[PDB]
Amino acid sequence: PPGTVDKKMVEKCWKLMDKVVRLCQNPKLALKNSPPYILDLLPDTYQHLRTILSRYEGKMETLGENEYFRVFMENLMKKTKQTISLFKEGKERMYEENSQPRRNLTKLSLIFSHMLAELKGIFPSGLFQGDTFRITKADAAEFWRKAFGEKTIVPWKSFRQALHEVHPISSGLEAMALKSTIDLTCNDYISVFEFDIFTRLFQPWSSLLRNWNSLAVTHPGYMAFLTYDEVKARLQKFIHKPGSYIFRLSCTRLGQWAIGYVTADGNILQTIPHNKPLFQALIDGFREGFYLFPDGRNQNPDLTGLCEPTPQDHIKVTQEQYELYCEMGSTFQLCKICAENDKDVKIEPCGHLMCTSCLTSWQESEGQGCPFCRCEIKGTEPIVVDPF
Amino acid sequence: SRRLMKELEEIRKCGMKNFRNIQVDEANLLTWQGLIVPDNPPYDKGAFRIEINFPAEYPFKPPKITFKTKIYHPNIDEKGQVCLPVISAENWKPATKTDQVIQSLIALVNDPQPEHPLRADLAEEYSKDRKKFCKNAEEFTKKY
């Protein structure tokens, strides 16, 4: 239940963003022109937030009680804080190169990029329009109405159940995987925007989850949280194996794919297929000899069979397949102890981070001191304190 | 629980030696079967089967490592039970990855130095009897 929003909160958040902006202008990182483009995103979401504050000049109560705007603002501060902890957590390894810290800064950057997309999507020109937000693919557009009416955002549980009615979600881990795919903003909430994107990416709706398991969960080709520059960097090791390719979410064309292949002449190119489902693109490209080695791999999964009335049976996907898939995204905000909830507490005398849920779960079973350094607890504290 | 599934891929991915062939149907995740291969001391191949048993409250209570396929060693018991610190209450911390325990079990079989098993009528032979001990340990691994 995210609370009411008001200028003081928005400005609270704006100070934490500036902190993050200051962390990233460090030259040792040269992020001035790195794909998600964080030093452009924070200033940009800040500047758009002011616009929202302007359009609601005098209607700040209305705005402040908007479920979406409330969930948004909560998540924006949560994420600007993960970032701050990230730089503090990993220290100099941040200025390394190809390091986990920096790997996570990019995942986060990618999230900020999506967050700002969703924001501009729901608050075009500053005015809230989520209740009239136009889902692109009519079939999905129905599912949403008939299930959330004009709702701009729904809890993961509500969405998952609503979806299960029409697209059976096999089991436990499948739902988790499906979630780290649709929850672009990573806030356990699914927005009408987040939904429109996902339903475009994995069209046609008629086979929504079949497509999603064949293209993303299992397909060695699919890459999660990758930017234009990381693809180029990844395909580098196959620059001598023309035909090697990988695909991912386009960042400047949300809801569209970006395929990166190595050419005959040994170059790495990237394209955003026009008017056609990813799999027709991948089948055709394969047939035409362009896409042959998913992430370098020699066997290229057959996607024919995502075609015509009542298209085949459901591929089997192990619990291991889903686990490996989930480990693709986020995770760094996750608590090492349970590996499922966000770290939200910093044990104090020492300093270990962990989800409050576990801290509480350990003490209740009488576990001596800190779960990490079995040292005395004394007091807890926010992983990242509010701006002073 | 989702920590088990992470713990799993943790060891599976890192194909450590000494520990090969890992078993467990992903419809339980609570019981783990694996095979170990020593080095320094006598011990060698055969049927060195283990089974890790994670209690419902993992990782808040440590897992129990018990041998399902016989062996010698001072501290290790005949029922199967074993006894190392890192996986024993009063010393256990929920942070530790199973990974590093099935490696602190290597410093048990290989180059040992136990305190006292659950039968002095087995323990006392090492303090003075290099013959029948080190023998029925380099022969025992072969005859079973």
Place this chain on the structure above:
Amino acid sequence: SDGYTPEPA
């Protein structure tokens, strides 16, 4: 910087 090209021939 970047570059998205047309779909393969």
